[PDB]
Write a protein that binds this ligand. Structure first.
Ligand code: HEM
Ligand code: HEM
Ligand SMILES: C[C@H](O)[C@H](O)[C@H]1CNc2nc(N)[nH]c(=O)c2N1
Ligand SMILES: C[C@H](O)[C@H](O)[C@H]1CNc2nc(N)[nH]c(=O)c2N1
Ligand SMILES: N=C(CS)NCCC[C@H](N)C(=O)O
Ligand SMILES: N=C(CS)NCCC[C@H](N)C(=O)O
Ligand SMILES: [Zn+2]
Lengths: 411, 407
């Protein structure tokens, strides 16, 4: 069976067969669509099939399907599974794996870059200090003095579920949130709970509005440890506006390197619970969501006040006007300091190209419209008009519970 | 599989039990989400009728009553004997309000119970249809103080006798493709405009020509009729700050009146059922004016504002968009024509979702359609999980009549 998606701006119709390789489930049924729901030990049993399936794809990717090298590999993984109960990926398979997990990530608008990933193999890592060292090299390699390069660092895979590697931070760089006694929040409200744990673990909090959090690192199932990223490795950008000179006086900055650190990377049925990855920012991530979500820094009011907008009625669109200026300011500051960033028009246009290409060359491209459409000016971007099919392919990046919820304290 | 939805801005969690009544299919499976796809006999009729009457009598608290059973009895006899049946007026009104109640794509549903239903099931000709339509237009428009309405033409019988309004909305502007390849007027209506022209209409060929009504009774060939201009309330678009704005020469109409949908009630099909409410500002100011395939006025606006159009990262498109939308809202408000902004409408919808969860055990909602086409994440609906499913009575899409009509 073959499925059509139409783009309603251009009439371009595309044909999807790739969804026929979907194994995992969407969370939807014939009777209910869950397309907008945020989140809808493994033994020998399921393991060889999952391995075989990955290796067939891998050997196909390299035009060696059914080759002796292919057959021997299946044989050896099989024997390793029955004997040791798990198996090790070769370097080539890991790189390919990490690349496909990105390629298959339906909520990522940046996928046109998928094949250029820099994969850092941290599977020889044994301790949290070793983790801190790997992560430092990742931040420095990816930051690259403002000319950002995609990277991922892969820590040892899960074994029995009791020896997990985890990065307890949700991103490698993020600001502290602090709940004040009067009920207000200082810094980023999104990181209040994580901040508290850091504080409890012994972190001395400067208690400002932009304090870079310490790394909280767990190796081998052991209690996690704190480390401070060398500030010289943390590239930040002060926010100003090309016309509003009072904008700088708001005191805003952001970090240049977005580095998701809490997802799980599954390759050939193997689980990499610590696999921090990084690319670079689309401007709206910062200017719309980080700055203007009511539950984040929420600057709309103060920006609007300074613009002397009519704030007495929503239908003045004061909120929308401030939002544009803040996003102009974010992109301008980044470009000025020569730090990599992409605006939402450029990114979404690239995405449509990537997506058409992927349909032609691959048979499709799983895409989550809810997440792909940008959080401002949605319909003036070409993705708004693009029908998408969403489905789950492996290799993949999955959510996992926050470790402070499941971890067993050595104490 | 009683389901939770969470608002991520507020942490309000709501339990959905209403979805366990869903009947029709979504288009999705366990293996594929199709949430962003635009369009994903006697034996059949009685269960359909039963399911509807059961809800009706439940709604007025005479579930299981003699009057309930008697009605079921009666309708059943009438199907057996006549192969269809007729809705009581009360059932028709309930059915229409509920079809709007169930429309998972409509953000305006807080208003659902206030619908004015005009029963046109005694209509027999296109002239009669024109008369009904003008009365609807005039009633709904109400000199700018708009009022919700639907007008319901006779139901399908054998599919060879359908009533249809061929227009997609009662009131829309014409589209003409030019000698130089461009388009004057509304490009979305280029083809309908052709059918009107190749049906007799004399196009003024301007940028904002109100299209004629093309109306079809009892399966006959449809007929043209001009809406009395004095019943078409239009708004000249000016900006409260940019005096040059009015020289753009933009106007829009006050009455949004979708006319190409199919209303199903208790298994009966009403293939002509035009309904109207009033505009959320973005519909005109974002989609109608700025979509690339519609009036596409972004460059000309940004130019008059002297914006840096050299690079997309100046957000000139975005800047222009805010201003256009301020001008739409301002114009309608100045001329006292009902209009709602996207902030105010989405806040209402959240409140309505609240009400429905509490009073009905859920509210079907299609996030893809409910989040406005500008400033999505600064409206509360962006942060709101929604469960989408199909309840009946419903409004359904249907093919365009020209593909179907046997002349
Ligand atoms: C190179 C520049 C990149 C851009 C501009 C980009 C863009 C984005 C954006 C805008 C999102 C939505 C994030 C949000 O709203 O919170 C996202 C999600 C995602 N991206 Fe990327 N991305 C990039 C690189 C990467 C890389 C290197 C990976 C992995 C190797 C990745 C995997 C993902 C995943 C798994 C998600 C889903 C996140 C979630 O479910 O919370 N992306 N991407
Ligand atoms: C009272 C003011 C109303 C507002 C503000 C409103 C708002 C909207 C909006 C913004 C949409 C999406 C439209 C688009 O983007 O093309 C919509 C769709 C819809 N509304 Fe309403 N609505 C209102 C009244 C009504 C009424 C009176 C009915 C029917 C009785 C109705 C039924 C629908 C349906 C079926 C859709 C989806 C139509 C489609 O798929 O094209 N609404 N509504
Ligand atoms: C409830 C809803 O699904 C949730 O707000 C999603 C919507 N789309 C998104 N899109 C992106 N890119 N990032 C997000 O956090 C979200 N949040
Ligand atoms: C491809 C996609 O489904 C299509 O653009 C949709 C998206 N959301 C929408 N939302 C509304 N309110 N109206 C629309 O026409 C659309 N179009
Ligand atoms: N572009 C990327 C690499 S996937 N970022 C991902 C998440 C960053 C988050 N939205 C933030 O705004 O900090
Ligand atoms: N608000 C309504 C009544 S449901 N309109 C809906 C369809 C009109 C279309 N979006 C337009 O912008 O003309
Ligand atoms: Zn779905």
């Amino acid at each position: 069976r073959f499925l059509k998606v139409k783009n309603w701006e251009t009439d371009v119709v595309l044909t999807d067969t790739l969804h026929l390789k979907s194994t995992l489930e969407t969370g939807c049924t014939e009777h209910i669509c869950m397309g907008s729901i945020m989140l809808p030990v493994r033994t020998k049993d399921q393991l060889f099939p999952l391995a075989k399936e990955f290796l067939d794809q891998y050997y196909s990717s390299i035009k060696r399907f059914g080759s002796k090298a292919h057959m021997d590999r299946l044989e050896e993984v099989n024997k390793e599974i029955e004997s040791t109960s798990t198996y090790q990926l070769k370097d080539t398979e890991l790189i390919y794996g990490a690349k496909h997990a990105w390629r298959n990530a339906s909520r990522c608008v940046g996928r046109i870059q998928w094949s250029k990933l820099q994969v850092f193999d941290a599977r020889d890592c044994t301790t949290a200090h070793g983790m801190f060292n790997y992560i430092c090299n990742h931040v420095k390699y990816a930051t690259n003095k403002g000319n950002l390069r995609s990277a991922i660092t892969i820590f040892p895979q899960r074994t029995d579920g009791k020896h997990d590697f985890r990065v307890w931070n949700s991103q490698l760089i993020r600001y502290a949130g602090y709940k004040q006694p009067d009920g207000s929040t200082l810094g980023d409200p999104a990181n209040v709970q994580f901040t508290e744990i850091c504080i409890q673990q012994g972190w001395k909090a400067p208690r400002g509005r932009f304090d870079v959090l310490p790394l909280l690192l767990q190796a081998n199932g052991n209690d996690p440890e704190l480390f401070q990223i060398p500030p010289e490795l943390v590239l930040e950008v002060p926010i100003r506006h090309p016309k509003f000179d009072w904008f700088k006086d708001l005191g805003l900055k952001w970090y240049g390197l977005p580095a998701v650190s809490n997802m799980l990377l599954e390759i050939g049925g193997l689980e990499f619970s610590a696999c921090p990855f990084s690319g670079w920012y689309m401007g709206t991530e910062i200017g719309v969501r980080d700055y203007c979500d009511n539950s984040r820094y929420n600057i709309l009011e103060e920006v609007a006040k300074k613009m002397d907008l009519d704030m007495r009625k929503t239908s003045s669109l004061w909120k929308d006007q401030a939002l544009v200026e803040i996003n102009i300011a974010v992109l301008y500051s980044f470009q000025s300091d020569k730090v990599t960033i992409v605006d939402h028009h450029s990114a979404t246009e690239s995405f449509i190209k990537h997506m058409e290409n992927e349909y032609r060359c691959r048979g499709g491209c799983p895409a989550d419209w809810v997440w792909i459409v940008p959080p401002m000016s949605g319909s003036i971007t070409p993705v708004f008009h693009q029908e998408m099919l969403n489905y789950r392919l492996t290799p993949s990046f999955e959510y996992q519970p926050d470790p402070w919820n499941t971890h067993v304290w050595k104490g």
